[PDB]
Amino acid sequence: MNINQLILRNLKKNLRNYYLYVFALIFSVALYFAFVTLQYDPAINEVKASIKGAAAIKTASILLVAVVAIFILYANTIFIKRRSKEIGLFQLIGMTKHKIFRILSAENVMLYFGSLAIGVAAGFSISKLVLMILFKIVDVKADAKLHFSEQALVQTVIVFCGIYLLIMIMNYTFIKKQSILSLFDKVKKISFFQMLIGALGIVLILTGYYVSSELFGGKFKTINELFVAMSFILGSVIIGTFLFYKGSVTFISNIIRKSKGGYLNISEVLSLSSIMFRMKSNALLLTIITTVSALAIGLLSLAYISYYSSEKTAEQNVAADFSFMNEKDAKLFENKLRESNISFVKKATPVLQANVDIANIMDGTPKEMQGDPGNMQLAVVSDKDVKGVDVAAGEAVFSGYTDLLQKIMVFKDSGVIKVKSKHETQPLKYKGLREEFLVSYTFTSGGMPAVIVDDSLFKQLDKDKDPRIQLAQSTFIGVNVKHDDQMEKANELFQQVNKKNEHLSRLDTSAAQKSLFGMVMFIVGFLGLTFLITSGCILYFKQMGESEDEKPSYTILRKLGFTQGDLIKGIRIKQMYNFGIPLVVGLFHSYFAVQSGWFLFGSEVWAPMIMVMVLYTALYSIFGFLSVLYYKKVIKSSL
Amino acid sequence: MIKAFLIERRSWIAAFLFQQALMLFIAFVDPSISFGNVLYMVYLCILFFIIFLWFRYRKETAFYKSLKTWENNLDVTAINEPETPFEAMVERSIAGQTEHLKQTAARHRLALENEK
Amino acid sequence: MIKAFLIERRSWIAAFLFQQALMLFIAFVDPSISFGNVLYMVYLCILFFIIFLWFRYRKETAFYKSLKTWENNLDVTAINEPETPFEAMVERSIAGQTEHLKQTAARHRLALENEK
Amino acid sequence: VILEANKIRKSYGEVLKGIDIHIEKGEFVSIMGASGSGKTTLLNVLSSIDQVSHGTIHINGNDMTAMKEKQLAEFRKQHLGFIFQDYNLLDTLTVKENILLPLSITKLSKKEANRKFEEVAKELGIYELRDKYPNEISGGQKQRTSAGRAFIHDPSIIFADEPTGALDSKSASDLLNKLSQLNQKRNATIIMVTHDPVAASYCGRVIFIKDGQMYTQLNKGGQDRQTFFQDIMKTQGVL
Amino acid sequence: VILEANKIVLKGIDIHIEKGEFVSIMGASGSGKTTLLNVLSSIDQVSHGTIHINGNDMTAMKEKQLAEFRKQHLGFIFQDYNLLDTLTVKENILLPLSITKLSKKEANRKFEEVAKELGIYELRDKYPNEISGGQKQRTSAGRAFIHDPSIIFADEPTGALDSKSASDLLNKLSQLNQKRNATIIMVTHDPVAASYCGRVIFIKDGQMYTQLNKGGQDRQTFFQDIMKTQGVL
Ligand SMILES: CCCCCCCCCCCCCCCCCC(=O)OC[C@H](COP(=O)([O-])OCC(O)COP(=O)([O-])OC[C@@H](COC(=O)CCCCCCCCCCCCCCCCC)OC(=O)CCCCCCCCCCCCCCCCC)OC(=O)CCCCCCCCCCCCCCCCC
Ligand SMILES: CCCCCCCCCCCCCCCCCC(=O)OC[C@H](COP(=O)(O)OCCN)OC(=O)CCCCCCCCCCCCCCCCC
């Protein structure tokens, strides 16, 4: 018939088959349009963090384009590759190489631009939703409005038109480089080279995991050693994962088949007919999917770990609801709260800074930590200063668990601790392992705890105090107020006091941490969600091509006597392995990466991390179910 | 047959559940609107939907229950008059083939006596 | 065909739109609930429902539209295989219709040939 | 008897017009005729492949027709064996797991499964190729392992639509000798269709069909191959 | 002559084929049966040797111009059933004629005659995705013959076809060749499909050593006749 009718019919088949690609394209266009709208939205300036909101969104916008253009270019590459059969037939019909390209371009234009127009409308509808999501995540109260911005529409049109220009170049160069002769064993034993590759892949993966388990144990001392170790473990995991998909997966599949003997059920035929010979054909694609998914899960879990513990960490860095550097501002602030009929308590806790030899009780080598245990600045608090546990003469206590502290500083339960002041040193003894933190991190280090000494010794060395080791403050001012609802009124009144931002408030530190890590979680979570859609669609298309390659096997099985329902169970198990192996290794990479750095961010790691995989697995199994439905259709039409 | 009707309307069941999932998600994310009032109303709406689902099943599946007249010699029993357009087309096709069965029996009876 | 599909599913689309209509009533009367944000929230669900309705139209009417072949005089071919239990029972009755007709014709033909 | 047909007739075409068929346990019989005369269609109707419009068929006393598609699947997978002319093997599976493909659904212990295979393989001369993929073995072995797959679960009636359809003269003789010996030592009745009298010479009863009619009952008579080979040749030429 | 090969890339073969002579080439994995077909089909892989289709001189300049002689005077049959899914069976046969500005009525009875002799008329409007592989392969053969050519190239058409479909397709092709004389150059990997032809040439490394032609004997006699020749290799 006429060429136009053929183009329309081809579009209908493409829409029916690649419906996931259209949804992914619409989702990518809609999400990108919302992100650009958020970048130029004047209401986004209400967020306050270390990184500017506009700059962070723009960086995410560039990353979103890269993660989408790569998926779109790869998806179109395999679309033409699977269409090469009809490409050669058209060349055999008699049309020139330009008319066939025109037909392919016309069908692509009517589909790509149609989804782009729908995606723009979808992006306009969801622009308010993503803005409200960001505001809720970073905990800011403002008014979100639904508006259409001309610049956002122009930017997304230019970017996606340029992306399609790359598609047209790729499609044109594929037609020209393919001649007429284009429309016309895999099973073998395991070789010695496959033996070495398989063993090396597992060895490299476990070697990287073991290094992570001992990354912060104290083996490395300098920052350069830590950085070179990080490069080594990243390289080992990537190489190990690539070798795992190349030869290791074949050996594990070969081993179980040999162990099972020659008695294989229907489920063991389809499952073992793909992972032995098809996993290694696309090792690079699987490795990239696994690596990025593990990185996305790891980054998201770590950001959620900090977000979950942000309030605890804000309470960690402080000692009360407020911290004051000078007495004059405290006098100004106390009068402001006094006239506000709110009861408050101001505590004055002098602290002492000196050098203490803790290496005598430092378990193992004293080179694990960054510095000298013999000469290091430790906060000293008098016994009368706090109301915890009374300390007798010749005894000491260490306050502040700070889990990161324990790993770096592996404290013991008994020993002799040596304090080296400006004058004659005195020997003490400590137990440690406390919770309540008596000193804010403005004098002592972020993880360094504070030693408690009997007040008799503290009053004794008042005349002999090291002038070398003392920052500015000595006495510490902490202000707390009654109930909990008074936090907001105190915080809003405290804002006008620290005009130079020289003070430090618990609420302000929590809010800054909430906004900074919330923005990172928002960026990583949405980018990971986009990658999840693209990776699932790519794997769905790979299974689509593999399904057509396994059609003769299904025809033989049906002719043998196996029913369609019997093959459904085998397909479900096979698809579970195909969509589960990348997920299982991906989760293992994320779990061992989080377990090696969770203490650097927060204190609770189990609950936030488990939720991330559970959410990720649930949203990842949808593509596996869709692949099963396509497989059910294929085997139904097989015979 | 409960397991059959639920599979029939599993798409509509999921759509209503997804609508409520979106209904909760927007209310939770958006600070201007409350979430407690939406939660209470959703529970009331789900309870009303369950009652409506049972009422819809009883009225609609009655026609397909009577379609089991061909299991045995119950063929003499008449199919209940349909109301929905989908069932009306089904009944029209069944009636058309029934007349097809009637006319071929008459044609054979005509042929049998003509040959005599 | 669209008119027939909408007439059948009139009760279901009314149930979906009843809760949306309910919100536009309480929001218009509840000071604690902003009407503007609810209107966008309702609009998002309406957009989803319209897309869902269009997707379900082709899926839920493909079998019944093809069933019109049996009714007319082009009944010399087969129809699409059923995929859901309710239309499977309709196909089962249709399949039982042809088998009984084929059995009756074969038996009558054998009797006619036996007396020759 | 284990097979009985009461005027089986297929209305499609008309290929079958009513033929009475019956065999005894442990019998080697062949049905043939002219090309396109319906010899192939008998195997598709005796087995439940396209059912039938007229007539009834009995297998081991159980009805072979008038059943739905649920219990019909169990019947073929339990009491019926198939020896296709095409190999119908799997390249991903070796000979060992290809032979024990249909025995998996029975779900028996591996101890007895490895014993049934040993008895079958030693009786077929295919033991040495227990772990060789189909692409690494000759066509004769591919047909032999196909026959072993049909004989692994010891069925009642096995259909062999031209088993020697792609085998040489030596391979056909070897396969027929193995099948005849296998039937004698297992007392499992097999039927087949053959386009050449050489393959059907190992039978005990030969009956020919065309346009759905039954002609003659060529009993073996218990003599050597020389008498039977000439008798089947002259009858086929006359027919 | 009609198709005469003169030192036909391979080592140089001298074969003589007359009009409407069904032929098949038999070789091994290292012999290059597919490579011989590509050089015999003579589109891109051509370095030495000349193919004379009814005395026509070859090696003009390019495959694209070589593409337009075969468009009008060469059908093509393959094993993957190169049929468009969206296209109907009737339109698939008429697809090569849709490009040329025809009256759209000449293609009508030309399809009718093809669907009457070969036989596709029972599924004229049936989509290829809902029919058996035995009919898709048959339809592809009819699509090649709609170009009313004299030479048809067909590599291993019974590759994904069972025995019944292979036997059905070959006898349809054999009688179609008798109806309209046209040489059918084919390659084969299984000796079953190499018996219906009328001439088989065996290549061990790309040379013509012994050719077998049928006669009073046919089918099984011809099948075993080439089995011993293939067993020699
Ligand atoms: C508090 C908690 C609450 C949380 C809230 C959220 C809850 C969690 C999320 C829920 C996740 C669960 C979902 C699982 C359900 C699975 C669906 C199912 O059962 O389907 C089976 C079933 C498969 O059945 P089957 O037997 O295989 O049948 C084959 C097909 O049906 C045969 O195809 P077909 O004919 O049916 O359809 C063909 C075509 C039909 O469509 C069309 O033809 C129309 C469109 C065509 C476009 C092209 C235009 C062509 C025309 C233009 C011509 C002129 C233009 C000219 C151009 C200019 C040139 C001059 O379909 C499409 O391609 C349409 C695409 C889908 C439209 C939706 C658009 C996306 C909306 C954007 C989302 C916004 C979210 C942003 C972020 C949110 C953050 C809060 O699916 C269908 O029936 C197809 C439906 C289409 C896809 C729906 C599924 C979505 C994709 C799955 C994604 C995986 C989920 C992972 C996360 C979610 C996304 C992030
Ligand atoms: C939290 C992370 C971010 C999540 C973002 C999600 C964005 C929306 C993406 C679509 C999600 C739809 C999920 C709800 C679907 C409910 C209906 C359903 O499940 O129907 C199942 C049915 C297929 O099953 P059945 O008909 O039984 O046949 C099986 C064999 N084919 O299905 C069908 O027959 C097809 C009809 C249903 C499928 C298409 C529905 C598309 C709806 C898109 C509208 C989006 C509106 C705006 C969303 C706001 C942001 C979330």
How many domains are contained in chain E?
Answer: 2
| Close Cβ partners of C3 (under 8 Å, ≥ 6 residues apart) | none
Give the C-alpha separation, A352 to B19, whole Å.
Answer: 62
CB-nearest partner of A180 from E67, E84, E86: E67
Three-state SS letters, D56-97: EEEECCEECCCCCCCHHHHHHHHHEEECCCCCCCCCCCCHHH
| Close Cβ partners of B91 (under 8 Å, ≥ 6 residues apart) | B79, B81, B82
Whether residue D85 and residue E163 make contact (CB cut-off 8 A), yes or no, is: yes
Q: Is the CB of residue B32 less than 8 Å away from at least one CB of chain C?
A: yes
- E114, burial (CB in 10 Å: exposed 0-12, middle 13-18, buried 19+): buried
Radius of gyration of chain C (CA): 25
**Ligand 2 centroid – CA C52 distance (Å):** 7
Task: Judge whether A497 and A330 are in contact, CB under 8 Å.
Answer: no
Give the C-alpha separation, D8 to D18, whole Å.
Answer: 5
CB atoms within 10 A of CB E17: 18
Residues in chain E: 233
- Identify whether D200 is part of a domain: yes
- Ligand 2 atom at minimum distance from A125 CA: 47
**Ligand 2 centroid – CA B18 distance (Å):** 8
Task: Supply A254's token pair.
Answer: 């070969």
Give the C-alpha separation, A636 to A22, whole Å.
Answer: 25
DSSP of chain D: --EEEEEEEE-----EEEEEEEE-TT-EEEEE-STTSSHHHHHHHHTTSS--SEEEEEETTEESSS--SSHHHHHHHHHEEE--SS----SSS-HHHHHTSGGGTT---HHHHHHHHHHHHHHHT-GGGTT--GGGS-HHHHHHHHHHHHHTT--SEEEEESTTSS--HHHHHHHHHHHHHHHHHHT-EEEEE-SSHHHHTT-SEEEEEETTEEEEEEE--S--HHHHHHHHHHHHHH-
User: DSSP assignment, residue E3?
Assistant: E
Task: Judge whether D57 and D8 are in contact, CB under 8 Å.
Answer: yes
Give the C-alpha separation, E184 to E154, whole Å.
Answer: 7
CB atoms within 10 A of CB E73: 15
- Residue C103 C-alpha, separation from nearest chain D C-alpha, in angstroms: 8
Interface of A with E in 504-523 (CB under 8 A): none
**Ligand 1 centroid – CA A20 distance (Å):** 7
Task: Supply A263's token pair.
Answer: 């008695």
Ligand 2 pocket test target in A125, A131, A568 with most atoms within 8 Å of CB:
A125
Helix (H, G, I), strand (E, B) or coil at E153: strand
Regarding whether E131 and E181 lie in a shared domain, the answer is no
Give the residue carrying structure tokens 């090309």. D35
Whether residue D86 and residue E190 make contact (CB cut-off 8 A), yes or no, is: no
**Lining residues, ligand 1, CB within 6 Å:** A 15-16, 19-20, 22-23, 26-27, 30-31, 109-111, 113-115, 118, 122, 126, 129, 529, 533, 619, 622, 629; B 21-22, 24-25; C 55
Sort strands D205-210 and E199-202 into parallel, antiparallel or unpaired.
Answer: unpaired
Annotated binding residues of E for ATP = 27-34
Whose alpha carbon is nearest atom 7 of ligand 2?
A27
Name chain A contacts of E108, Cβ cutoff 8 Å: none
Give the C-alpha separation, B34 to C26, whole Å.
Answer: 13
Choose the mutation target among E163, E218, E221, E229 for the interface with D, i.e. most D CBs under 10 Å: E163
Regarding whether E164 and E221 lie in a shared domain, the answer is yes
Chain C touches chain D, with at least 3 Cβ pairs below 8 Å, answer: yes
Strands (E), chain E: 3-6, 15-17, 23-26, 50-53, 75-77, 151-155, 183-187, 199-202, 211-213
Whether residue D92 and residue A185 make contact (CB cut-off 8 A), yes or no, is: no
To 10 degrees, the CA torsion angle through A398, A399, A404, A406?
30
Give the residue carrying structure tokens 């009461």. D6
Whether residue D73 and residue A553 make contact (CB cut-off 8 A), yes or no, is: no
Whether residue C41 and residue B33 make contact (CB cut-off 8 A), yes or no, is: yes
Give the C-alpha separation, E141 to E76, whole Å.
Answer: 8
Whether residue E67 and residue A6 make contact (CB cut-off 8 A), yes or no, is: no
Q: Is the CB of residue A486 less than 8 Å away from at least one CB of chain D?
A: no
Whether residue B29 and residue A141 make contact (CB cut-off 8 A), yes or no, is: no
Whose alpha carbon is nearest atom 61 of ligand 1?
A19
Whether residue B19 and residue C15 make contact (CB cut-off 8 A), yes or no, is: no
Give the C-alpha separation, A287 to A244, whole Å.
Answer: 9
Task: Supply A119's token pair.
Answer: 């995606």
Q: Which chains touch A (3 or more CB pairs under 8 A)?
A: B, C, D, E
Name chain A contacts of C44, Cβ cutoff 8 Å: 125, 129
Task: Judge whether A271 and A570 are in contact, CB under 8 Å.
Answer: yes
Choose the mutation target among C47, C55, C70 for the interface with B, i.e. most B CBs under 10 Å: C70
Task: Supply A194's token pair.
Answer: 């496959």
For chains A and B, CB pairs below 8 A equal 13
Method in brief: cryo-EM
End-to-end CA distance of chain C: give it in Å, rounded: 51
Helix axes C10-26, C35-66, angle to 10 degrees: 180
For E226, name the nearest residue in chain D, comparing CA atoms only: D168
> Nearest Cα to D179, choosing from D153, D193, D198, D160?
D160
CB atoms within 10 A of CB D78: 14
Whose alpha carbon is nearest atom 16 of ligand 2?
B15
> Nearest Cα to A410, choosing from A433, A444, A380, A379?
A433
- For A452, phi and psi rounded to 5 degrees? -110, 130
Task: Supply C21's token pair.
Answer: 């209509």
Give the C-alpha separation, C12 to C16, whole Å.
Answer: 6
Sign of the Cα torsion E222, E225, E227, E230 reads negative
Sign of the Cα torsion D100, D105, D106, D111 reads positive
User: DSSP assignment, residue B95?
Assistant: H
> Nearest Cα to A134, choosing from A45, A243, A239?
A45
Beta bridge partners of D8: D19
Helix (H, G, I), strand (E, B) or coil at E26: strand
Give the C-alpha separation, C56 to B15, whole Å.
Answer: 11
- Identify whether D103 is part of a domain: no
For A264, name the nearest residue in chain D, comparing CA atoms only: D97
User: DSSP assignment, residue A244?
Assistant: I
Provide residues of E within 8 Å CB-CB of chain A: 34, 38, 43-45, 63-64, 67-68, 70-72, 76, 78-80, 82, 84-87, 91, 94-96, 98-99, 129-130, 155, 160
Chain A touches chain D, with at least 3 Cβ pairs below 8 Å, answer: yes
Choose the mutation target among A126, A128, A129, A131 for the interface with B, i.e. most B CBs under 10 Å: A129
- Identify whether D173 is part of a domain: yes
Element (H, E) at B75: none
CA distances from E9 to E32, E35, E66 (A): 10, 7, 17
For C43, name the nearest residue in chain A, comparing CA atoms only: A125
CB atoms within 10 A of CB A159: 18
Domain final residue, candidates E90, E121, E148: E148
Helix (H, G, I), strand (E, B) or coil at A371: coil
- Identify whether D117 is part of a domain: no
- Identify whether D229 is part of a domain: yes
Give the C-alpha separation, A209 to A619, whole Å.
Answer: 27
Domain final residue, candidates E148, E166, E194: E148
Regarding whether E158 and E47 lie in a shared domain, the answer is yes
Whether residue D11 and residue C106 make contact (CB cut-off 8 A), yes or no, is: yes
| Close Cβ partners of B75 (under 8 Å, ≥ 6 residues apart) | B69
Enclosing domain of residue E100? 81-148
Whose alpha carbon is nearest atom 83 of ligand 1?
C55
- Identify whether D189 is part of a domain: yes
Regarding whether E154 and E144 lie in a shared domain, the answer is no
Which long-range contacts link A309-313 to residues 24+ away (Cβ below 8 Å)?
Answer: A309/A601, A309/A602, A309/A603, A309/A604, A310/A510, A310/A513, A310/A514, A310/A517, A310/A602, A311/A510, A312/A602, A312/A603, A313/A510, A313/A513, A313/A602
**Ligand 1 centroid – CA C55 distance (Å):** 9
Task: Supply A163's token pair.
Answer: 């992306």
Give the C-alpha separation, A463 to A476, whole Å.
Answer: 20
Name chain D contacts of C106, Cβ cutoff 8 Å: 11, 53-54
Task: Supply C83's token pair.
Answer: 């995929």
Q: Is the CB of residue B111 less than 8 Å away from at least one CB of chain C?
A: yes
- Ligand sitting nearest the alpha carbon of A627: 1
Whether residue E67 and residue A183 make contact (CB cut-off 8 A), yes or no, is: no
Task: Supply A274's token pair.
Answer: 């793909």
Whether residue D104 and residue A266 make contact (CB cut-off 8 A), yes or no, is: yes
Helix (H, G, I), strand (E, B) or coil at E198: coil
To 10 degrees, the CA torsion angle through C48, C54, C59, C65?
160
Annotated binding residues of D = 33-40
Domain ranges of chain C: 1-74, 81-116
